Amino acid sequence: VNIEFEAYSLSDNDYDGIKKLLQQLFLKAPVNTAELTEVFGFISLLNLTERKGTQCVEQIQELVLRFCEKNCEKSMVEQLDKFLNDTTKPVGLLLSERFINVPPQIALPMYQQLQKELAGAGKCYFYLLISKTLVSLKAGLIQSRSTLSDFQGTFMTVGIALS
Amino acid sequence: PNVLNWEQVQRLDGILSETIPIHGRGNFPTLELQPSLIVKVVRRRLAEKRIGVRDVRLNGSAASHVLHQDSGLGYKDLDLIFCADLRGEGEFQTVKDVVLDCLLDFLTPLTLKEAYVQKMVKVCNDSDRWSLISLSNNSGKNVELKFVDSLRRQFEFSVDSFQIKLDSLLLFYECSENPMTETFHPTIIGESVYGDFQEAFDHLCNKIIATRNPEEIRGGGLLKYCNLLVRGFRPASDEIKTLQRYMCSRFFIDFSDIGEQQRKLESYLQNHFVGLEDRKYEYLMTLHGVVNESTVCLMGHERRQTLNLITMLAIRVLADQ
């Protein structure tokens, strides 16, 4: 099951609003210090078990379909707050339970191999990414090859926040 | 029958040969693109990549315009469907690459993408295996290239449920000289999602609404229904009580909070109402009318706080001249 979304007609204020919405999730996440060896977002390994897996895909696909409306650029951030930061939402809970913000040296490799899976042609990955170079809110849920099998585990959301 | 008459055919040629602005964001060179040119070349480069197109169709406000100009559904959105057989994960990538190999001719794929593309959504799930590209325009006019392999049923009104197969017309475009007259006119077949094209068009003629798949009624279905209601599309349905109960219920389920309601009505007033003024206030009062008269399971305090959210917004419209 692939679901891939790309939106580039976003306002600079919509970029900052999602950046702030994303960074509040970063505050809710413990940092990996002294344990290991513009893009803003998270990459979450989502095992497709019939329970937590199906419920999350339900919520993710529903939001994506909700974003296919005629314009909806304003209601994007409101829907995003009530989606990735709310209660009884299988996705927001996933983003509250096992979330880790990681330093650049770890995060870049993930954004790189993620980019290659979405462009070249296993583990299920749920991602959301905003990049400014040009706004590019790219999100999805794609069956791919391993991106961070070393540090990532099942239902562990890795935070990618770089410059 | 299903075959379009001449005037319809001429109007079809109209909205497909008349150019659209591809407004410039980032990369600023705007692009005057004729829809017929994109539809042709997209179909061509797709069949050339051996993808196998079944039909290229037109949907929504546009098809309802070529069939009967009288009805309120105004041609303000060009919705283009590419019914095909896309199953491989790479088939969606080469569809992407075709549309981007087309928009370079009319002037690197990644850069052109990041410039003028509003959305790129692909869904490969249990029944939906479709892809969509929305080209951007500052005037709000939206062009949607939808490549749909398989798509689930959806809540469909009669007069919005129209699809016209542009393939017989496409042939006339690749001939050097477009050989079109009243005598040499391509037999173009119109179709409907709601059901019998004879039924559905008659609904379009004399301003009737009727639904199918009410099981898939969405949250905002109530909002769009009043848009038909404000456009003179009176429901001849004497089953309208159930229908109105059906859509009100889902609106307050999907948007339970009052603040979440205000955001939806503020957005629907903002986007779905363009070039309309008394329509906005009329729309708000007809929504009021449907809620107060038809809903039947809103709590006491919830009913008032919603109805009064409508009246506040109607004051905002009145206060703006």
Residue numbers in the entry:
A (entry chain B): 57 to 93, 123 to 206, 214 to 225, 293 to 322
B (entry chain A): 63 to 169, 179 to 392
From the paper:
The FAM46 (also known as TENT5) proteins are noncanonical poly(A) polymerases (PAPs) implicated in regulating RNA stability. Unexpectedly, our structures of the FAM46A/BCCIPα and FAM46C/BCCIPα complexes show that, despite sharing most of the sequence and differing only at the C-terminal portion, BCCIPα adopts a unique structure completely different from BCCIPβ. A helix-loop-helix segment in BCCIPα inserts into the active site cleft of FAM46, thereby inhibiting the PAP activity.
After extensive screening of various constructs of BCCIPα and the FAM46 family members, we were able to obtain crystals of the complex between FAM46A and BCCIPα-ΔS, which contains deletions in flexible loop regions. Strikingly, the structure showed that BCCIPα adopts a structural fold that is completely different from the structure of BCCIPβ published previously (see details below). Furthermore, A DALI search of the protein structural database suggested that the fold of BCCIPα is unique, as the search failed to find any protein with substantial similarity to BCCIPα. In contrast, while the β sheet in BCCIPα also starts with strand β1 at one edge, the strands are arranged in space in the order of 1-6-5-3-7-4-2. However, in our structure, this region forms two β strands, strands 6 (residues 296 to 303) and 7 (residues 316 to 320). Consistent with the published structures of FAM46B and FAM46C, FAM46A in the FAM46A/BCCIPα complex adopts the same bi-lobal structure, with the PAP enzymatic active site residues in the cleft between the two lobes. The N-terminal lobe contains a large β sheet that is covered by several α helices on one side, whereas the other side of the β sheet faces the catalytic site cleft, presenting the conserved catalytic residues, including Gly122, Ser123, Asp139, Asp141 (for binding ATP and Mg2+), and Glu215 (the catalytic base), to form the active site of the enzyme. Our observation that BCCIPα can promote the nuclear localization of FAM46 is consistent with the structure of the complex where the NLS is available for driving their nuclear translocation as it is not occupied by the binding interface with FAM46.
